Each structure stands twice: as C-alpha cells, then as structure tokens.
C-alpha cells in the first residue's frame, strides 16, 4: 500500500497472509473455513495466516493454518486477469475472535464514489521498493467505469472496477494482492492489477465480488 496509514493491529480482522516459506499475498477470511483471494496468488503449498499484524513477529493473537484445497475460478483468464478470484479452504476451522472474524459477502454491488479500505503488507513506494511489516491501510473511492475504462482502454471487464483510487495512493501495490477491498462492511473487491503502483491516470483495478457470490456459495456448500 502506497500512500496509505498504519492501520493498527487486528484493526482488520478478516485480513489474511498466504505464506509459502515468506508472505505473497493478501486474502480475506470469509467463515471459519474459507478465504477468498486472487487467481493470480494461487500455488501449492500455502499456509493461511489469521490474527496477523506485524508478519515478521510472532506477537500472540495469529493462527497459522494450512490450505487443504484451492479452487481457481473456472473462467480466470491469466492474460487479461478477467475472473481473478479464487478460494483457498482451510486444513482445521479458524477460531473467531475479535481479532480474527470474517467478512460478509456483498448484496448489492457497490457504488461509484464509495469509499472503501484496501489492505495489505504490499510495496509502500511508487518508486522502488520497501515491505513494511505491518498491516498498512487505504481509504479509496470507487471510480467510474467510464473513468476506468479511460485509464486502461480496452482491458476493463464487467468483473473489474477502478478505485486517485487518478493524481497518483500517490494505491496498492506488489504484495497487496489478493487483499481485501471493503465498503460499508462487505467485501466488494480484490486486489488484483494495475500499471505499477502512478499510484497518475493509473488507479488500481479489482475484482468484482459482487459478480462472484452464486459461485462462492455453490462451491463451499460442495467442497
Ligand atoms: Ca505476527
């Protein structure tokens, strides 16, 4: 996260680490069982890290469970990143706390202009490189499709929206992905591309959750 704050610790109880020998990406907790990422983050071999602040200390409140099964979307395409969104089920349910809690699955798809929270542990430059080890968090609009598209011509799908995020947060970032984007409590996106991080004209684009919950709950009812 570029521009962004330091959230503070369990602030963001549904926020996850995927962890293969080091963290690579965000995720979000969505019961006990579940957690919803990017396709772009899959691998074998993940270990699921609840109750995390600072990732490089064990600091009491974590829970380190590992991936039983990842289900990639059915039509992710990883040209284009249309449909980045996967599921990632856990090995032993999570024990919820007030530092470890899932998030809702949207009703509605959300609003233009709504401010929502990105998270993540993610690259804090635009230009170079530096990972902070606590969670870091970003207040960001949802823009328009029509300014979306604008940014990136051609390569904007029903399943992704743009959220200055067009002046350059000046954004997510390289490890931010898979993270949680939330408005008015439901997790409405994922973090999933973007050109660099210019954080001018280049926001951040996401996965529409929204379009994903009949496959969300057919999966987990069967898996
Ligand atoms: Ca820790």
Same mark, same amino acid.
């Given at each position: 996260?570029? #521009? ?173 992905? #898979? ?5 008015? #409590? ?38």
């Amino acid at each position: 996260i570029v #521009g962004g704050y330091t959230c503070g610790a369990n602030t963001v109880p549904y926020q996850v680490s995927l962890n293969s020998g080091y963290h690579f990406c965000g995720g979000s907790l969505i019961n006990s069982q579940w957690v919803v990422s990017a396709a772009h983050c899959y691998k074998s071999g993940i270990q699921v890290r609840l109750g995390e602040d600072n990732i490089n200390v064990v600091e009491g409140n974590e829970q380190f469970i590992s991936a039983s099964k990842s289900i990639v979307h059915p039509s992710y395409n990883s040209n284009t990143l249309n449909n980045d969104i996967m599921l990632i089920k856990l090995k032993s349910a999570a024990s919820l706390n007030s530092r470890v809690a899932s998030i809702s699955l949207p009703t509605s798809c959300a609003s233009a202009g709504t401010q929502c929270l990105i998270s993540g542990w993610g690259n804090t430059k635009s230009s170079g490189t530096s990972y902070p080890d606590v969670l870091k968090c970003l207040k960001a609009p949802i823009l328009s499709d029509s300014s979306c598209k604008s940014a990136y011509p051609g390569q904007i799908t029903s399943n992704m929206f743009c959220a200055y995020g067009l002046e350059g947060k000046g954004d997510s970032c390289q490890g931010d992905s #898979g993270g949680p984007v939330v408005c008015s #409590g439901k997790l409405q996106g994922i973090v999933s591309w973007g050109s660099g991080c210019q954080a001018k004209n280049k926001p951040g684009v996401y996965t529409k959750v929204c379009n994903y919950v009949s496959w969300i709950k057919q999966t987990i009812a069967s898996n």
